[PDB]
Every structure is written in structure tokens, then in C-alpha cells.
Design a protein around this ligand. Structure first.
Ligand SMILES: CCc1nc(N)nc(NCCc2ccccc2)c1-c1ccc2c(c1)N(CCCOC)CCC2
Ligand SMILES: *[C@@H]1O[C@H](CO)[C@@H](O)[C@H](O)[C@H]1NC(C)=O
Length: 333
């Protein structure tokens, strides 16, 4: 099965799912960086303006709803949501599965008012599931219908004309229509986390970063490519970028000349051009241009670690192999 994704400003990729009977529709981000499922609850106080601006799940309108009530709190590096667990039938591109999900009742203005999606569908391992809830992919596999224990992501470059698919997730395999050459794999350090070993990071002609090695979390739920404050400060200085409150910037006119940045994964250099990592929205020297690379300190056990989000997946079609506990990259097309 495949799910069509919408690309919002190159920073948010989401698709649709259906919950309950009759189906209640929701926009959600398929996130390899988390393992739980959640959507806003009709029980979310309207005092949370974020709940006033999103689709809310009303249990009392679903004849397939199954109460639970256990509380849970999901924490992402940029925000937190809280609520309780509920069960109901979820639709994901043709596939129908009974699933346990979080009904959020506390959804902070910052950052969820800036969220185009309503909720999230974790594609991570059960080892990372808050409340030990079975992840939706695990449940789908238990039906022995998928041809393979894998799923793939394609994130298209933002488009200005509503006629190009924003992105696509394939449950069961990959789609040769969106990648060329063949895959190249790197094995997961440990099962339970979509994190792999990264041999090094280079900016231009000098492997100045992540020498000796470092970790890389492959996060489909992350807008950018991120590293530890230390690492980024070092990377950014080599680019001549000035730090701000939430990002790094360069004079727009300097963007096109910025050097390449390479990530050494499993004996294969993955290279990005400045066009790949800077939001070139002008060529003026009198204006600042943001970079799609941020600093983000991720705490143990997962971190410290780099994160390969949307900025990296736009360029490289990604396959998440569960059966073999490896990740595969190929040139996006
Ligand atoms: C999909 C949920 C999610 N999962 C994971 N693993 N990390 C997140 N941020 C931690 C990583 C991160 C760092 C810096 C900026 C954005 C995300 C977020 C998360 C949380 C809040 C918001 C997000 C993303 N977005 C971006 C959606 C991404 O779609 C592909 C915009 C609205 C507010
Ligand atoms: C919620 O689901 C979990 C999963 O097994 C179960 O152990 C728990 O008892 C349920 N809570 C209630 C009261 O239904």
C-alpha cells in the first residue's frame, strides 16, 4: 500500500489516515523518530488554541471505539503533547488495523499552532513505544499481507504548482519510480532505533567533523539535518553562517557559493549541494537566508547524535528494513 503525502513549505510532510466508524479523517506525519500514534482529542480544552485549529477525534461518534484511558506523555525535541490511550480501527492506504492510539488533550500553542498536520503515526520500534503500546507497523505485519517487512519514504522538493505529489510512503516495499541506481545499506547499531553508524562528516575539502565516528538518527519526522551544538557551531563557522535564536543564516547572495557537505555512511559519501541545504529565497546581500541544517542536542540513550531528516531524504530515497534491521539509501528521482 502507498499513501500520498502533502509537502508543506519543505518543512512538513503528512498524509491521511482514517479513525473509527464512520471514518474520522486526520492529517498525520509518518515519523520514524517516534513509535506512538496520536491525534487531537475532542476532549482537548478549547483553551489550547492549537486544538481549536485541528481535526479532533470524537470517540462518541465511533461505534468501533474501545475505551482504555491510560495516560501518556509524548516528548519530541521541540515540543510535548499529553493525553490518554484509546483503541479503534485505523485506515492507512487500503490497510485496516485495530490500533491503540493516544488521544491528546494538552497541545501547546508553540509549536502546534504552526503544525499543518493534526497528529503523528510513529514508525519506530516497540522498544521505544511510550506505555509499551504496539506500533502500528508491527500490527500491520501481524496480518501477513505485506509482501515485505519494509517501508520506504520519498520526499519531493517543494512545488509551487499543485500537480506534483508532495511525497510518498510505501508500506511493503519501495517504488522504483522515485529512485535510481541501486540501494546501499548500513546496519542499525541496535534494533529498536532507526539509528546507524556514521563514519564521518565533511564540509568542502577537509573531513573536519565527526572524525573517530558518531551516530545518525534517520528521522522522517524531522524537518532538518541536525547535529550537537558543538558539531553545528563548528560546521556553521566554516560556512560563514551567523547563529540566531532558532536557526543559522547567511547573506542570501552568499548561498550559491557555499561548499558541499558530505555524510560518510557505510562506505559511501552522501553529498549535498548548497542548493540542497539552503532556502535560497533571494540572491540579495541585503537579506538573510536560512539553512536546512540545525543544532539540536538529543539526550541519551539515543543521543548525542546527528539527525537525518527531510533535508537528507529529499535527496536520497530511503528504505526502512525491519526484517534485516538495516536502512537503505538511493538517489531520489
Ligand atoms: C512528527 C512529530 C515529530 N517527531 C519527531 N521525531 N521529532 C519532531 N521534532 C524534532 C525534530 C525537529 C527539529 C527541528 C525542527 C523540526 C523538527 C517532531 C515534531 C514536533 C512538532 C512539530 C514538528 C515536528 N514539525 C515538523 C514536521 C516534520 O515533517 C517531516 C512542524 C510542526 C511542529
Ligand atoms: C489499556 O490497554 C493495556 C494494554 O494491554 C491494558 O494492559 C490496560 O489494562 C488497559 N486499560 C484499561 C483499564 O482498559
Amino acid at each position: 500500500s502507498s499513501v500520498i503525502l502533502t509537502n508543506y513549505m519543505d518543512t512538513q510532510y503528512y498524509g491521511e489516515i482514517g479513525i473509527g466508524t464512520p471514518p474520522q479523517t486526520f492529517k498525520v506525519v509518518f515519523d520514524t523518530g517516534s513509535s506512538n500514534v496520536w491525534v487531537p482529542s475532542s476532549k482537548c480544552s478549547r483553551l489550547y488554541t492549537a486544538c481549536v485549529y485541528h481535526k479532533l477525534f470524537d470517540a462518541s461518534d465511533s461505534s468501533s471505539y474501545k475505551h482504555n484511558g491510560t495516560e501518556l506523555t509524548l516528548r519530541y525535541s521541540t515540543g510535548t503533547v499529553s493525553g490518554f490511550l484509546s483503541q479503534d480501527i485505523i485506515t492507512v492506504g487500503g490497510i485496516t488495523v485495530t490500533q491503540m492510539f493516544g488521544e491528546v488533550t494538552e497541545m501547546p500553542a508553540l509549536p502546534f499552532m504552526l503544525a499543518e498536520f493534526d497528529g503523528v503515526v510513529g514508525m519506530g520500534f516497540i522498544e521505544q513505544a511510550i506505555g509499551r503500546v504496539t506500533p502500528i507497523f508491527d500490527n500491520i505485519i501481524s496480518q501477513g499481507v505485506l509482501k515485505e517487512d519494509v517501508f520506504s519514504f520519498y520526499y519531493n522538493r517543494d512545488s509551487e504548482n499543485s500537480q506534483s505529489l508532495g511525497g510518498q510512503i510505501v508500506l511493503g516495499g519501495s517504488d522504483p519510480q522515485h529512485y535510481e541506481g541501486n540501494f546501499h545499506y548500513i546496519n542499525l547499531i541496535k534494533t529498536g532505533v532507526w539509528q546507524i553508524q556514521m563514519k564521518g562528516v565533511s564540509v568542502g575539502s577537509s573531513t573536519l567533523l565527526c572524525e573517530d565516528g558518531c551516530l545518525a538518527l534517520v528521522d522522517t519526522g524531522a524537518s532538518y539535518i541536525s547535529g550537537s551544538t558543538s558539531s553545528i557551531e563548528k560546521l556553521m563557522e566554516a560556512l560563514g553562517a551567523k547563529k540566531r535564536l532558532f536557526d543559522y543564516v547567511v547573506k542570501c547572495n552568499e548561498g550559491p557559493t557555499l561548499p558541499d557537505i558530505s555524510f560518510h555512511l557505510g562506505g559511501k559519501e552522501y553529498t549535498l549541494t548548497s542548493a540542497d541545504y539552503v532556502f535560497q529565497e533571494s540572491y540579495s546581500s541585503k537579506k538573510l537566508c536560512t539553512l536546512a541544517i540545525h543544532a539540536m542536542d538529543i539526550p541519551p540513550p539515543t543521543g548525542p547524535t546527528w539527525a537525518l531528516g527531510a533535508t537528507f531524504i529529499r535527496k536520497f530515497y530511503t528504505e526502512f528494513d525491519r526484517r534485516n534491521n538495516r536502512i537503505g539509501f538511493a538517489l531520489a528521482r
